[PDB]
């Protein structure tokens, strides 16, 4: 019944730099993302593991939001399996990445007439970083002190002037990541639950797990964290009602 904010993720007066991308966890909410279709008219809104429309019918266990600001033409770096400074030195996504990417132009908010300086990025790095890894250390990479031949400062700031043409204007990027259907559900939209019917061939949707069959009382004793029941055939045998805690067997019609 709770409504997780999506405010401090999106409605934030100052996003973090790409090299220090802000990480937030979302849990225990009715994630009505339906605002996110059109509340801002994003330039880029692309989803990999699931179509955006179907996202209202899937229940998650963990949701992570990454917020930062990157150079315009560099937005394509955010897709998985890409290469370049942004996608290799300060932010990388896994090949099997699920969840999806939102990016919108923010020239007015972030650009400064004299050139913005809050937003930084890592240009020098010893080696590529693993997916969803954050590095903040600011030692000098190829040398003592801070400067010298090949002794260059790792971090540089975009000269975000408003007069910069498209492809240089700062873009604000928010990336969502969430797992699908292996644990007790924690985050998903309304999907207003109805009364539960037993001993009758009906379709059912429990925490995203969809099926059709006959629901019966069962004597199996699952553990407190256990949610799904399975057979040797790997089918779904027994599930526990999220609202009230009892176990129900499913029999094919």
């Amino acid at each position: 019944t709770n409504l997780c904010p999506f405010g401090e993720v999106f409605n934030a007066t100052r996003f973090a730099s790409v090299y220090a991308w802000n990480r937030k966890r979302i849990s225990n909410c009715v994630a009505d993302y339906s605002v996110l279709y059109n509340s801002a008219s994003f330039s880029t809104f692309k989803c990999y593991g699931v179509s955006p429309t179907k996202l209202n019918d899937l229940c998650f266990t963990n949701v992570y939001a990454d917020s930062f600001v990157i150079r315009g033409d560099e937005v394509r770096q955010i897709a998985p399996g890409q290469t370049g400074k942004i996608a290799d030195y300060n932010y990388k996504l896994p090949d099997d990445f699920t969840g999806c990417v939102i990016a919108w132009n923010s020239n007015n908010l972030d650009s400064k007439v004299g050139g913005n300086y809050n937003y930084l990025y890592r240009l020098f790095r010893k080696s590529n970083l693993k997916p969803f890894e954050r590095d903040i250390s600011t030692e000098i990479y190829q040398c003592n002190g801070v400067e010298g031949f090949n002794c260059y400062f790792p971090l540089q700031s975009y000269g975000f002037q408003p007069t910069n043409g498209v492809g240089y204007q700062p873009y604000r990027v928010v990336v969502l990541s969430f797992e699908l259907l292996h644990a007790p559900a924690t985050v998903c939209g309304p999907k207003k639950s109805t009364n539960l019917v037993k001993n009758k061939c009906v379709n059912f949707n429990f925490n995203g797990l969809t099926g059709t069959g006959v629901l019966t009382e069962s004597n199996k004793k699952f553990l407190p964290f256990q949610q799904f029941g399975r057979d040797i055939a790997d089918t779904t045998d027994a599930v526990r009602d999220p609202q009230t805690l009892e176990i129900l067997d499913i029999t094919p019609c």
Partner: antibody
Amino acid sequence: QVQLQQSGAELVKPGASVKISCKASGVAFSSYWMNWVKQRPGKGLEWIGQIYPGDGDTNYNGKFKGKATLTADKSSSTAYMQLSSLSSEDSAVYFCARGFIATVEETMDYWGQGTSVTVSS
Amino acid sequence: DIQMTQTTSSLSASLGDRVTISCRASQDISNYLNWYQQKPDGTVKLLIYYTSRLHSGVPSRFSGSGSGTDYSLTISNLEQEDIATYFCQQSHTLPWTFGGGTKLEIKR
């Protein structure tokens, strides 16, 4: 309740300097821009300047650059505005507003009661 | 800086009638416009943002529309407390500017 309260009316001799305080209650004052706006009577609103209490980031209008100084007070959650080299034309009503972000733009959602400042002898 | 202009400095209207206030900008600002309302006593509050989003606590009788360099605020049914001064402010470029402001009166 989100309340932006300002000081009373000021009477200032020309050439002096005057301080105006805008205190925010019920707001995360250190996470949103404070925009200061001038209104002469019968004339349109003029965007004086803007400050970020979180780190002191400031953006000043070209016309009012240098003339007005903005400072932040995290402890009491108050934005201070200092006016120097006052003249008779500076007599106006000054508002402090909060710069919320609608994820695309910045809007001055909550406004103060407005401080009337008059410069004369 | 972006030049913000309201064609009608003031206008008179009757109760309950639809009232349209225009706002023309020198340069395209997409839909980065905000409508503010200032009471005669001096109190001012936000009314509309992003040219179509109704602010919290604002009666639904207000609406916004427009694109490019021309926008308009519409009152579906004018009511007594709606009599105020309306300002359109851009947010495309950092030196934000406000319109000249439009004042409403009764037909008399």
